[PDB]
């Protein structure tokens, strides 16, 4: 155990990971490093996604580490995407090792970037190892620093097994494969294992390490990271963050910090052409085999046809899947505005949760409707803050903190999730012209004057299209909706009456005029 270093990399823009592999061996790697002390160290490097959509997946990977390398471009500086992960890595007791990369570039300013790390992250950066990507010098010095500072792993190898599931995927030949950290005990080949969430037991048919090449082993001992193949049916059967133990001597308690994350953002997806339904259903199925957190459930509108109601972790989780659906499976989809999860107290005081507005209990039965609030961390040059908070309050945000970092401002606001999810990020980007970095996570539910806009077209109730929004801009969101539809619905054979209402009271009503005879229905570019 004492010669093992488990660490992850927090960076942005040959990446350091590739150069480390090159001076050792030659998503995760197990490497050997003969150090200046003449001894050999097993380096286990777990990769880290940079976005707060995968906030949980990130934290589970970090729970598998004792340290992390904060890799900053010496020619650029720090950026908020590495900040979120950096703080969580520090909240958990991980040794964060600062690295100044790309010192070779004509732009490199190491001393000033050493101040930026010290000022914004609060890590001792004065003796940070620095390294070239052109030549590769310093990478060994980084590795030496890694070995000296990151604590070795801990546990009892004879203790009852506790293996942290870092990640689980589907292999088209091997079945389900899990990347595993042995926190406690020892896992051998024959061993019959138990997944602690599910309570189900399987045989460890195969296990090994990534070299990067997939290499079989006969056991994974304490402090180690590797892969495991037992015939778990789907990746849901080995949830990320779960803990593996042995069936004959099961651990009393699972490793802390496990949860099965439920989608934060729901949306409705419908194929432009009904003929694509078969492919779309297949595409979601194919996606779901590797996406542990993608939720999808059939939904059919009168208006929009047969499609699917889908749950996502956040905006670019949705956008990754949308981009994938669009390009991999060549599907053209209509997508409804994203709607978030509300917390509602019934007249008979019970707490229920609402994904889709249509399901929200009657206005008479609601004692208190509670709205999700997102805490938004932002980095922006001083010349834009006026343009930024004016948007923040415009979206009903409340300022929680502000810190100055040279000629740069660190804003932290409390903006209603419902509103962050409806393209706020874009309006922020165009008012700061790409200079404001968003970073948000769920904070709290709060009581709020929240109403439900119902769409009906051809007098038919389109539940898929319903939205929950605040009173003060229900008139505007209803009006924008009727306009959005006028784009999706061209002038056709019949008149199409579109309207938004609150219960009985109509807020906007527009009709899409029918074509004359012998005129084809056209659409805008």
Curated annotation (Swiss-Prot):
Localization in the cell: Cell inner membrane
Cysteines paired by S-S bonds: none
GO BP field: positive regulation of translation; response to cold; response to pH; response to salt stress; ribosomal small subunit biogenesis
Residues in the signal sequence: none
Residues bound to GTP: 101-104
Main localization of the protein described in the UniProt heading: membrane
Keywords for this protein: Cell inner membrane, Cell membrane, GTP-binding, Hydrolase, Membrane, Nucleotide-binding, Protein biosynthesis
Xref: InterPro entries: EF-4, EFG_III/V, EFG_V-like, EFTu-like_2, G_TR_CS, LepA_C_sf, LepA_CTD, LepA_IV
Pfam entry (one): GTP_EFTU_D2
Top class in the EC scheme: hydrolase
One GO cellular component term noted in the UniProt record for this chain: plasma membrane
One GO MF term attached to the UniProt entry: translation elongation factor activity
Highest taxon of the lineage: Bacteria
Topological type in the membrane: Peripheral membrane protein
Domain tr-type G: 2-154
EC number of this enzyme: 3.6.5.n1
Catalytic activity entry: GTP + H2O = GDP + phosphate + H(+)
Function: Required for accurate and efficient protein synthesis under certain stress conditions. May act as a fidelity factor of the translation reaction, by catalyzing a one-codon backward translocation of tRNAs on improperly translocated ribosomes. Back-translocation proceeds from a post-translocation (POST) complex to a pre-translocation (PRE) complex, thus giving elongation factor G a second chance to translocate the tRNAs correctly. Binds to ribosomes in a GTP-dependent manner.
Similarity annotation: Belongs to the TRAFAC class translation factor GTPase superfamily. Classic translation factor GTPase family. LepA subfamily.
PANTHER family: TRANSLATION FACTOR GUF1 HOMOLOG, CHLOROPLASTIC, TRANSLATION FACTOR GUF1-RELATED
Protein name, per record: Elongation factor 4
